[PDB]
Design a protein around this ligand. Structure first.
Ligand SMILES: *[C@@H]1O[C@H](CO)[C@@H](O[C@@H]2O[C@H](CO)[C@@H](O)[C@H](O)[C@H]2NC(C)=O)[C@H](O)[C@H]1NC(C)=O
Ligand SMILES: *[C@@H]1O[C@H](CO)[C@@H](O)[C@H](O)[C@H]1NC(C)=O
Ligand SMILES: *[C@@H]1O[C@H](CO)[C@@H](O)[C@H](O)[C@H]1NC(C)=O
Ligand SMILES: *[C@@H]1O[C@H](CO)[C@@H](O)[C@H](O)[C@H]1NC(C)=O
Lengths: 159, 220, 211
């Protein structure tokens, strides 16, 4: 189940961002399909709660090539809520840059691009501080809500 | 700052060595092994990244080396070409990953470990005199010495006049002969006029075989 | 990938600037190059990583530069400790090393004092024969030895040994041992050792006859 994580990590600027994958001062695009050869690390798509996306092909068959074959892709469109709620996904590209995808913010009350449910809050997930180092001092709040019928328990990181 | 490795070993051809690697909180992402034959540069023996369980090896080593994890490295089907110093490296920060390996700069090296592939056993040396003669090549200087030949294993130590003669002495590094036995020569340049008046004695000591020899080197 | 260092040996005085060159056969893509030094009888120490970046603890006088196929290590001011062998390493693809570059103390050229030693009669009693040719106190380290037995160019039946650079006069010394069977040694008369060195206007040959 570990092969399903893309590992095209190209630390070209000598920043050491790949290290925390094994074990801070400087502090939209539509989620369709991304090529795994540009991804380094886990891909978290944000339904009301966070979910892990693994390397698959175009049909959706899971691949176990660490995201190296050019046919490897991430089907972010297939993870969308059918009821049409807010949606977004984040990941890290080969050179240590956090990438986001989601719906354009229709207003200040609407959601952001990544895990930004609010322009102030952020969905907590195991790799939040790796993709977003500046949110370390954010406060966590436990959240319960019904979206499209499903219950969703998750934590949000706000100022 | 040097990691602890297993002690030096001597193994027969076709045998198998197992060298260890001991961490000193400690952070590292893979286990590397770099080797260096006597009088050569650095060679990369395989790597092994524990978090992913994958491993790479070189073409020459692919058929007889594995690396696992304290980390370990094993060579099989040993030949004389595998006589080398073997270092383990546990680097800290990966720079280039490409599924399912990560390449970085070697960071925390071990002290090293000598591995000698020789079917020979312990044997004391034979000390022969490299005698001076009427061959003063530059300013009436004369060269004499001792040939410390056919000894195993390393090391052998030699002095002159029980330490009283250190100036002008050149004790060359040992050389492994085609027979698997080592050979070494210690020389010293002396004034030509002192060949018949001063006595020169080389003091050979091969502690493994417990062989001490004092050979007076004379002209003619 | 192949890494070729240049030059093989670099000869400078304490205080001068050293610039070592590492040239890759193929482009190193995103530059993943490292520099190491190895003192005589010691483990390698990481000096430079990722082309330009300096390793922690490494003094400021060490500097790395380059991209693509040609890389460079620079020691701005040579201290006595820095005289050692330096290796460049590529970790962009499969890890590879280049051959080292020796950095020794520069001095006036000294031609070697050459001596040839026949085998001792005690060794001939033991049944083997070793002929020894000595190159004493020369600079630079580059020297060539050619054995000649009855004008026959010997090839493959000898081994060499070189001392480390002497701490006081900065010269090198070399010994070349010619291995002959006792039977073959008796068959031939003249045993020569021709020596080629930068400090010699013409090659010098030391020789002896059995007797
Ligand atoms: C990884 O993400 C970064 C995010 O910026 C990309 O960097 C940008 O690359 C484009 C290339 O045309 C430049 O125009 C931008 O100026 C770059 N942005 C910054 C902030 O430097 C980078 O290209 C991405 N890597 C890959 C392989 O797509
Ligand atoms: C997973 O990766 C390993 C190492 O690259 C490889 O040996 C294996 O074939 C891959 N696939 C599966 C299904 O394990
Ligand atoms: C968060 O607070 C810590 C002190 O606990 C500080 O070191 C760090 O810089 C802060 N981060 C931001 C983004 O302000
Ligand atoms: C990642 O690094 C490899 C080797 O350095 C290089 O071939 C590749 O082009 C790099 N990735 C990108 C997107 O350029």
């Amino acid at each position: 189940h570990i092969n399903r994580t893309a590992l095209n990590c190209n630390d070209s600027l000598q920043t050491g961002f790949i290290t925390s994958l094994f074990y801070s001062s400087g502090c939209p695009r539509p989620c369709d399909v991304v090529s795994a050869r540009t991804v380094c690390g886990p891909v978290y798509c944000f339904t009301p709660s966070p979910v892990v996306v693994g390397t698959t092909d175009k049909l959706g068959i899971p691949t176990y090539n660490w995201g190296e074959n050019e046919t490897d892709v991430f089907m972010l469109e297939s993870l969308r809520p059918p009821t049409g709620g807010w949606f977004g996904c984040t990941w890290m590209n080969s050179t240590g840059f956090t990438k986001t995808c989601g719906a354009p913010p229709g207003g200040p009350t609407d959601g952001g691009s990544g895990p930004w449910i609010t322009p102030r809050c952020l969905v907590d997930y195991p790799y939040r501080l790796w993709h977003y180092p500046c949110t370390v001092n954010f406060t966590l709040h436990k959240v319960r809500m019904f979206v499209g019928g499903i219950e969703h328990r998750f934590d949000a990181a706000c100022n | 700052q040097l990691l602890e490795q297993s002690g030096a070993e001597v193994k027969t051809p076709g045998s198998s060595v197992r060298v260890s690697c001991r961490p000193p909180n400690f952070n590292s992402y893979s286990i590397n092994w770099v080797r260096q034959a006597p009088g050569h540069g650095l060679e990369w023996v395989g790597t092994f990244i524990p978090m992913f369980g994958t491993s790479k090896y070189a073409q020459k080593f692919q058929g007889r080396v594995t690396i696992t994890a304290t980390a370990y490295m094993d060579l099989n089907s040993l030949r004389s070409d595998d006589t080398a110093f073997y270092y383990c490296v546990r680097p800290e920060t990966p720079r280039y990953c490409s599924g399912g390996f990560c390449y970085g700069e070697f960071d925390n090296w071990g002290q090293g470990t000598l591995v000698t592939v020789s079917s020979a056993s312990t044997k004391g040396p034979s000390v022969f005199p490299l005698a001076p003669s009427s061959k003063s090549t530059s300013g009436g200087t004369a060269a004499l010495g001792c040939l410390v030949k056919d000894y195993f294993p390393e090391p052998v130590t030699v002095s002159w006049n029980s330490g009283a003669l250190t100036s002008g002495v050149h004790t060359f590094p040992a050389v492994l002969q085609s027979s698997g036995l080592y050979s070494l020569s210690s020389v010293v340049t002396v004034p030509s006029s002192s060949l018949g008046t001063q006595t020169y004695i080389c003091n050979v000591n091969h502690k493994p075989s417990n062989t001490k020899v004092d050979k007076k080197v004379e002209p003619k | 990938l192949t890494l070729t260092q240049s030059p093989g040996t670099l000869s400078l005085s304490p205080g001068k600037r050293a610039t070592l060159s590492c040239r890759a056969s193929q482009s190193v893509s995103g530059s993943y190059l490292a520099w190491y030094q190895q003192k005589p009888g010691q483990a390698p120490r990481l000096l430079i990583y990722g082309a330009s970046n300096r390793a922690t603890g490494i003094p400021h006088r060490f500097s790395g530069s380059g991209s693509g196929t040609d890389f460079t290590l620079t020691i701005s001011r040579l201290e006595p400790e820095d005289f050692a062998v330096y290796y460049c390493q590529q970790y962009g693809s499969s890890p590879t090393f280049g051959q080292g570059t020796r950095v020794d103390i520069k001095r006036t050229v000294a031609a070697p004092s050459v001596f040839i030693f026949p085998p001792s009669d005690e060794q001939l009693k033991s049944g083997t024969a070793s002929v020894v040719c000595l190159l004493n106190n020369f600079y630079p380290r580059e020297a060539k030895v050619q054995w000649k037995v009855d004008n026959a160019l010997q090839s493959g039946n000898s081994q060499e040994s070189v001392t480390e650079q002497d701490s006081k006069d900065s010269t090198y010394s070399l010994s070349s041992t010619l291995t002959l069977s006792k039977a073959d040694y008796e068959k031939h008369k003249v045993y020569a050792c021709e020596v080629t060195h930068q400090g010699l206007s013409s090659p010098v040959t030391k020789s002896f006859n059995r007797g």
